[PDB]
């Protein structure tokens, strides 16, 4: 029998020791390694309440990739409170690798199998644990990237529907990818996206908004106004930032059925995630850099004033990554073995 309760976590993670590789490199240091057998126990006659937007999971792995990034990031210049720090900033290998997080003694972590659980009420199926999965840390903005995907039907999360400034996260069941590539003006890159099979989801996740929203008319925008950070996709890829326009995406229309190809920049000034303010990098490296990403999760906030207009306006979010640890740990809950 157990109880609700908060505590601290450790991590886990299958790092290399001999790796230079920034993530390895604080795992090796700051994390156990994988659990060598885990064991969950499916535990019956048991319904459980949980809720992803009250989950002090989320705020635990937020603090792990903030000290994560600072340890293994390093501009030339950051720009906090008026103060101005200059330091040495080598260029660096980048690659996410997964994270688990495990109770210690007198705890344990319940697990929602629920396939089409929404994120928050209650769990029919409920399992234990004592570490999550492997989770990857990856820093986005209105794409959610090399994550998990909904084992059945698409599902809406958010904290309350009505609230037009409460985040909406759409977790897919089939992954896109998006393939994003800085050739040998050297910050000048670009994605490509099968339109056959974006257009083809987007229009899925259009109809599952039509659920929610009483059979209204969705409409797809860009952002309307921000920083750069938010009004691209923005993302890192082996240690460049990269910013991508995505209105094609976000789009209408649909002539359009090939490969769709968005434009991008390599950015060396950039406003950090952590709030802490300004920082510049130093020039991207030399030869082809490429990463190709799962598209596997988007993010969206609700227009304004359309309380008594026919539709509903929907245009990509981000900017809090707390919502990107949210998309991966909806599903777990710590306890108290009572
Ligand atoms: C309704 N939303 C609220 C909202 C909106 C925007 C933002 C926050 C909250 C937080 C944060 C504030 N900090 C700041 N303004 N300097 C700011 N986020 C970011 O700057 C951010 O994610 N950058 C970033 C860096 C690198 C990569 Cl690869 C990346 F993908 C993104
Ligand atoms: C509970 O979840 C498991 C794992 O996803 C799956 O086999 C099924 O949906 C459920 N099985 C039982 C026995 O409850
Ligand atoms: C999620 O499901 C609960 C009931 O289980 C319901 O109260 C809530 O409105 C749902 N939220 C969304 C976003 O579907
Ligand atoms: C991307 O998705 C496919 C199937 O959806 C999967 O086979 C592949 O391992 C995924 N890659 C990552 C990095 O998640
Ligand atoms: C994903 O879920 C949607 C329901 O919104 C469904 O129509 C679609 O067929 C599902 N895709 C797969 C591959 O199961
Ligand atoms: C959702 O937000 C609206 C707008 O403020 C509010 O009136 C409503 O009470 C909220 N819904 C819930 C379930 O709290
Ligand atoms: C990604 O794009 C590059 C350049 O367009 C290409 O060489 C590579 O084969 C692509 N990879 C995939 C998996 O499509
Ligand atoms: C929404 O539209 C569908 C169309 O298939 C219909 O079955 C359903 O009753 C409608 N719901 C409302 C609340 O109008
Ligand atoms: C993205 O491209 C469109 C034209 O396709 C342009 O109007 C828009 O300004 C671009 N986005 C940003 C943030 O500049
Ligand atoms: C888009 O996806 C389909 C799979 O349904 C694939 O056959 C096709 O090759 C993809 N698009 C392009 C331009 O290759
Ligand atoms: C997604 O995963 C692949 C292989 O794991 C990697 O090359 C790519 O960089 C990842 N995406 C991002 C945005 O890091």
Redesign the pocket.
């Known amino acids: 029998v157990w109880k609700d309760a908060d505590t601290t976590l450790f991590c886990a993670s299958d790092a290399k020791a001999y790796e230079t590789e920034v993530h390895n490199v604080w795992a090796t240091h700051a994390c156990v390694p994988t659990d060598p057998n885990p064991q969950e126990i499916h535990l019956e006659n048991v319904t459980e309440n949980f809720n992803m937007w009250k989950n002090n999971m989320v705020e635990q792995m937020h603090e792990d990739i903030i000290s994560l990034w600072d340890q293994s990031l390093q501009p030339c210049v950051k720009l906090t409170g008026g103060s101005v720090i200059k330091q040495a900033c080598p260029k660096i290998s980048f690659d996410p690798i997964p994270i688990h997080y495990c109770t210690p003694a007198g705890y344990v972590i319940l697990k929602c199998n629920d396939k089409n659980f929404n994120g928050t009420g209650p769990c029919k199926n409920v399992s234990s644990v004592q570490c999550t999965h492997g989770i990857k840390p990856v ?3 209105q794409l959610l990237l090399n994550g998990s995907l909904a084992e059945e039907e698409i599902i809406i999360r958010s904290e309350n529907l009505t609230n037009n ?1 409460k ?1 909406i996260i759409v977790h897919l069941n089939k992954s896109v990818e998006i393939n994003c590539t800085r050739p040998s003006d050297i910050r000048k890159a670009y994605c490509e996206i099968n339109g056959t099979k974006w257009n083809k989801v987007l229009k899925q996740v259009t109809e599952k908004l039509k659920e929610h929203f009483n059979n209204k008319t969705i409409i797809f925008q860009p952002p309307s106004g ?2 750069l ?2 009004t691209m996709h ?3 890829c082996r240690g460049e ?1 990269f910013y991508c326009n995505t209105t094609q995406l976000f789009n209408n229309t649909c002539g359009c059925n090939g490969t769709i190809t968005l434009p991008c920049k390599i950015k060396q000034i ?9 920082a510049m990098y130093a020039p991207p490296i030399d030869g082809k850099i490429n990463c190709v990403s799962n598209i596997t999760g988007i993010l969206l ?1 609700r227009d304004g004033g359309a309380n008594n207009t026919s539709n509903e306006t929907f245009r990509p ?5 707390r919502d990107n640890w949210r998309s991966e740990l909806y599903k777990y809950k710590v306890v108290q073995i009572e």
Do not use: H, L, P, R
């Open positions: 820093v986005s903005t400034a985040t921000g920083d950070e938010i923005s993302f890192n930032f950039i406003n950090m995630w952590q709030g802490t303010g300004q906030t979010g981000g900017g809090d990554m």
